[PDB]
Design a protein that fits this description.
The structure is a homodimer.
Chain A (H helix, E strand, L loop, with lengths): L1 E9 H9 L18 E4 L3 H6 L3 E17 L5 E17 L1 E6 L5 E5 L12 E4 L2 E21 L3 H8 L2 E2 L10 E6 L2 E6 L9 E7 L10 E9 L7 H8 L2 E8 L11 E3 L7 E2 L7 E6 L12 E9 L5 E7 L8 E12 L9 E7 L6 E6 L2 E9 L4 E7 L6 E6 L1
Parallel strand pairs in A: 8-10
Antiparallel strand pairs in A: 1-8, 1-9, 2-8, 3-4, 3-8, 5-6, 7-8, 10-11, 12-13, 13-17, 14-15, 14-18, 16-17, 18-19, 20-23, 21-22, 21-24, 24-25
The complex binds a molecule of 2 linked components (PDX-PDX) and xenon (XE) (5 copies).
PDB class: lipoproteinullntigen
Keywords: lipoproteinullntigen, penicillin-binding protein, integral membrane lipoprotein, immunogen, four-domain protein, antigen, lipoprotein
Assembly: dimeric
Chain lengths: 399, 402
């Protein structure tokens, strides 16, 4: 017959079926390759977040002495003296239980691995402490799967398969085991649940991390429209798995799909344990797993256990290529060097270093623009021009 | 007898009794200006987002320019906003006031209008007057609409006429923050009550900054939680800021033991304190040692007292570090940060952040020492980055480096 439960799949094993490729084809400071494990030299805060849903390994150096310091902001940090010659590599894994009333994440340890503490910078093994220096994430611990009776054994030993009465033939995201080493594309279910989330808004203006060509900030709310409580948001990210990127190029009607790309958490997507219900998705057009991507229209599909898929449509504007002249004199702002078309519905913000905006949400057009504010001669202002069809540009201008 | 309720007091009327001064002694802009005076009405240049937040608890007026055209766009988070064209010669000034009802399940603030004033919408950038729209350009805040007071019978009449006094069964002789009307034009220092309620807030943590908001020499970010230790829900935080009135600053100079009080200062919202309607339960308080209302203040130990209707006072202690008077030199080359001009001890436990004007940080809290510092980053030649240096014994410093 057929058994249902959860299995642990690497990023390549998960995406092979989704992209109609093979695991081998998907294996090949920044992570610009395909779906090989996401390695990173880090502190361990990302390791803490990922130990719940992902197969994580952390490397650390033996601590000889440490001291907790507080800086001028009131933030506390542990400084360690270590022996780099003595290292330990362990699995970091925890089983999320709930968000306590005090806002703390409650969890249980997992046999065979250490359970990192929130904001972890070290871990312990045989009563020795190790400062975290590297983190490696291989894939997802909990992928809902259907396993043919004859593959059950191989599933258990090779993909840590564990039958679970919560997974059935109608589970959203269910992937079927096809051979001893491959799984099918996931099957989507339209089954609705009270806790389902939908997009509140999606932004492209927040750039939380360096290294992406574009970033989408997906703000979430409950399907019935209610805003999410901290606990509801946490229950969601504690079940979040991955995101699919569908690219429609310059097709604003989302009719002609050009390509689909898989992603790897941390490198391409991230979330925090705080109170803002946001999931960030970034893309770098130069990574191998995004070969062929560029500015344009995207459809992002967030995939989480027990929740309906969350689909978000976004547009990443191309960069405006040269030729824009800005002048400031008296109350007049003059713009030249670009087509009158390029500047249609254009707008600007103007502000002098470190000061509140002198000019904000000011619609403008090619030529002279008589404003309300006076630009004090000698003062150097920053002028940010927002275009309708291009990424915004900012230049320094002296009135 | 004595009647109890709420009254509208100007900042000077409110602080006179708290500082043992008189209204007249407490009474003495354009974009870029700081409100560096005493307690006269806060009339500043602004977008209007602060205006929406203050219309609930404060007496606010907004000035706007006639809108000639507008186009919808989206902000960074994907929310709709408007870009405008206005006629600077046609302006209108109105009172902005709303009565807060509750936070909807959908996270939106529900409220009702107030006779004689417009009710701004969340994140408002304009307002309507006789079916015509005006883009907000200035805001003027006079004081607090709801101050709990005790009014002697003989004063009841002038109270209603001059301070918009309105009796209210929620206010009694035991109300925390109760101020007693002393004469036809003066109120006493507030009376503190230790009465505890389930909704009371306490300090969760306190953060300190030195270049966080334009104009502040130092600022404290007070994160809040419920008295029982529970994390606040968005609704619980909103109920608090919708009842928030002001903050008292008590200065202990260099006395880390908080034994010898050196002076007390009153504050004005928006100029000295601020909060948002988001999910983070934070209230920020700042100070500029050069403002007249803070005359004599300086680096040292402060005790901040948050004052809000129906809530126990929230007291927070914070220390603002001395200003580094030496002069530091910073340079960026390839993956190298060069630090000179300062002592060796002065750079002990120092750290830095490095980021281009409006870009994500390339360097976050990286320990540093005097001389050259190779970092996990490549600095684009010709690019001017911001380098913030946090010292152990001094306020942070930030500089522009190419
Ligand atoms: O205090 S937390 O632990 O919750 O950490 C907060 C951060 O949250 S997070 O979930 O860990 O990311 C916030 O991101 C940060 C700033 O929050 C403000 O800025 C956000 C983006 O810049 C906004 O989305 C927030 O608005 S929201 O309406 O809450 O979504 C905004 O919060 S606020 O308006 O209340 O100030 O604050 C903490 O570090
Ligand atoms: Xe690792
Ligand atoms: Xe993305
Ligand atoms: Xe105003
Ligand atoms: Xe509009
Ligand atoms: Xe402050």
């Amino acid at each position: 017959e057929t058994s249902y439960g959860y299995a642990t799949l690497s990023y390549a094993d998960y995406w092979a079926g989704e992209l109609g490729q093979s695991r081998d084809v998907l294996l090949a400071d920044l992570d610009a390759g395909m779906f090989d494990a996401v390695s990173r030299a880090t502190h361990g805060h990302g390791a803490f977040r990922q130990q719940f849903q992902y197969a994580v390994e952390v490397l650390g150096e033996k601590v000889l002495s440490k001291q907790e310091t507080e800086d001028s902001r009131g933030r506390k940090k542990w400084e360690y003296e270590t022996d780099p010659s003595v290292t330990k590599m362990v699995r970091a894994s925890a089983s999320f239980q709930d968000l306590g009333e005090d806002g703390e994440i409650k969890f249980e340890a997992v046999e065979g691995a250490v359970a990192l503490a929130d904001r972890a910078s070290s871990f312990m093994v045989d009563s020795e402490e190790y400062k975290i220096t590297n983190v490696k994430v291989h894939g997802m611990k909990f992928v809902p799967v259907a396993v043919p009776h004859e593959l059950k054994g191989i599933a258990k030993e090779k993909f840590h398969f564990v039958e679970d009465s919560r997974v059935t033939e109608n589970t959203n995201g269910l992937k079927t085991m096809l051979t001893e080493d491959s799984f099918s594309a996931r099957k989507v279910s339209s089954m609705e649940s009270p806790h389902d989330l939908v997009v509140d808004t999606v932004g492209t203006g927040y750039h939380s991390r360096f290294g992406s060509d574009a970033e989408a900030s997906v703000m979430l709310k409950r399907a019935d429209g209610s805003e999410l409580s901290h606990r509801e948001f946490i229950d969601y990210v504690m079940n979040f798995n991955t995101v699919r990127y569908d690219y429609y190029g310059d097709d604003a009607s989302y009719t002609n799909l050009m390509a689909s790309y898989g992603t790897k958490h941390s490198a391409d997507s991230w979330w925090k344990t705080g109170r803002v219900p946001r999931i960030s998705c970034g893309i770098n057009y130069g990574f191998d797993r995004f070969k062929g991507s560029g500015p344009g229209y995207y459809r992002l599909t967030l995939i989480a256990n027990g929740y309906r898929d969350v689909v978000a449509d976004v547009r990443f504007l191309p960069k405006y290529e040269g030729n824009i002249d800005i002048g400031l004199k008296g109350k007049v702002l003059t713009i030249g060097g670009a087509d009158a078309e390029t500047l249609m519905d254009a707008a600007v913000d103007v502000f002098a270093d470190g000061q509140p905006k002198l000019v904000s949400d000011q619609a403008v057009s090619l030529g002279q623009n008589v404003l309300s504010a006076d630009f004090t001669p000698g003062t150097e202002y920053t002028v940010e021009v927002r275009f309708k069809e291009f990424g915004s540009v900012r230049a320094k201008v002296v009135a």
